[PDB]
Amino acid sequence: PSLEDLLFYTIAEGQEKIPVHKFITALKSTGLRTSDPRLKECMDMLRLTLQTTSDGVMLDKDLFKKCVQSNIVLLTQAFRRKFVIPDFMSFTSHIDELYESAKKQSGGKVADKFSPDLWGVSVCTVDGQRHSTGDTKVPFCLQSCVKPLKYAIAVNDLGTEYVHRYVGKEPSGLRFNKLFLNEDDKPHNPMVNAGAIVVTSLIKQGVNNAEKFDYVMQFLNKMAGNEYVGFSNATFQSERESGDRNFAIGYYLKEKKCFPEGTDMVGILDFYFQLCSIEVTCESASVMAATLANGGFCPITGERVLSPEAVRNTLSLMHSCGMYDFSGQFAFHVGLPAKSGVAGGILLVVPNVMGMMCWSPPLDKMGNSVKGIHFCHDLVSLCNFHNYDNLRHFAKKLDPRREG
Template identity: 75%
Template sequence: SHSISSNIVLLTQAFRKKFVIPDFQSFTSHIDELYENAKNLSGGQVADYIPQLAKFSPDLWAVSLCTVDGQRHTVGDTKVPFCLQSCVKPLKYAVAVNDHGTQYVHSFIGKEPSGLRFNKLFLNEDDKPHNPMVNAGAIVCTSLLKVKEQHFFPLYIKAEDIVPKCVFSCTYCSCLISVFLQCFPEGTDMTSVLDLYFQLCSIEVTCESASVMAATLANGGICPITGERVLTPEAVRNTLSLMHSCGMYDFSGQFAFHVGLPAKSGVSGGILLVVPNVMGIVCWSPPLDKLGNSVRGIQFCLDLVELFNFHNYDNLRHFAKKHDPRREGGDQRVKSVINLLFAAYTGDVSALRRFALSSMDMEQRDYDSRTALHVAAAEGHIEVVRFLLEACKVNPSPRDRWGKTPMDEAMLFGHHDVVTILQQYQENYSLPAAPDGQERTEKSLDSLL
């Protein structure tokens, strides 16, 4: 009983289907299909310049997701640990902004895409690294972390999760120090900063644990599993903005165009994808394309927004051939029926025309099986009755739960003009045939205008 009482909100949401993805089973079946589609890809090369990465099989492929409600789904090799590598960069930046605020952090780091390879050692015209998603910016960002507080996603980052540090040449480090020393806060110990930088890149996660990190970003900084606030809304907003513009190496612009979601990739084959206010998704497959992104991961992301209206600029009301898993079927139907019947009750033909043009079912019924035509006939709204019959071609004689038709209602309340028009349409009415293409649709729309 204690476990029930402590999770009563979650359980209530489940029973009422109030989750952000109401039909989670149907949604995850689509995710599994997208996973299988991408699994068939065979291109790309596993990164071999870091020994810890070269050992991975190119056949490994995993997808995990966690919604802002804490619903989770995994498919594939989701329990195999891998290094975060560059996927840690947005998390570091978020913690830095969380600790210091936007203004302080960006006094050391820019906000613009660089147009250069992620490992190029260049500064912008203000002598700052271009953004926190390139190596130079991520190293400066590391120097801003309050390491002693250790609040950096403490549930998932443990001492034993840190793999042996990647070996970088002394020349690289010397170059960094000489070029970038001016970019750091005063008194920065470069050796300890670089040491921490390499350790953070080498943190091990699984797809499952990383998806909770992504979901925390999707949930405005609140961990959907614990309910604990990990990051400020400001830190999350900034992080998602930079992931959107700079998160996918030299593919960032194309990814923003085609996928339209904040994401960050790493050379270990991971992609951290955020659907704001909905879920976090992590894809992992070691083979990389020429730009350093997971071949299967990119394909999965492209297929995801092809199937669902998750792209940042998909219109949530008017979209063709895309699913919206956020839509609550029951709630939407109830609202739709209420709006339709109320417009019929008040005689609001313009509202009814709007509903018809947006493809609403004009024959839908309430809990008593009454239609808009029943209501309009009972109220004597002849213009509404005419619109429903002439423009919408509704059935003129549907029966409610008591067996009453709209004509029965009109006769009961003495609306003889309504009775006359209903009689005319009843005599000539025949059930509509199935639509036969676009021409019929266009004619139907023309009659509404």
């Protein structure tokens, strides 16, 4: 028995000692990055023993074991390739190829502000492995990408039954999106502005709007492994000064008695416009994506955020309702819960595998980003990620969950 030192020999070719860069690149290549929270101890003790000399440094089998003792369990499976993507290093080189192939899709137009050449993809597997290519550190607002996230919080806190005494669950229709309420005098489902507004009103009833936004922020922090979540006051005041269509939905719901008892209607939209201006980066948000890919458990902190009840329902509804009018075709050709917003954002989710976020600000005639859409077609072109692809017989596709 000797678990920590079995990885020393695995990195030290039956050898004297190893430099630390040789451990660092043999850890940067496992997908993981030196920044993983679950890796903090081990990474701390390397910041320590590097200052031990001004040497290499170079690690003993006991000096090594002293840093990796802490996180040894998720360290072995990284170097014993027990991650849901074993060969993470090649699978990035196609993400880069799918990125540059999609880089030339020129058509589209922004809404009305960013510059129309920006284009980033970022990836986070249900285990931690990360990759980014292109402009993945530039912030943008979620906008409607938040609609799944706040729906989860709501059923997380209330339960399916209560949450669905006020909103329905099926998709609208392709020329039935102009309506607000369904036959039961409830909104169609929580991915349309009509039902997203009734769900924004169930979140912590009895408390006020300053406090409520914190509560969401602390949920959304947990889902993103405490990576970047921000807030444009800018796009907030634009959102509440052009949201005429949204005030419309507001008053209709007040009269048809669709809000819970004693809901300051105007308080609730004010909140909603805030929620849409929350900022993220590509990298920030792929973690949020991967929290849903992972049953309500953040992949880079192991902290459980979302009841599974909540994760199931949010994914069922991103499937049918998440691309606006394109979701029926999306759920057909790509067949992945996804959620686009008008920023260029697609909160792609590959259940039990990984999580993504794409960003090109040029949008198409339906409200989806041009390069964003194209990408997902080429991604499920290549690998058997479509929800009803077979994991055993998948013809000429590539399953990154296997090796060789």
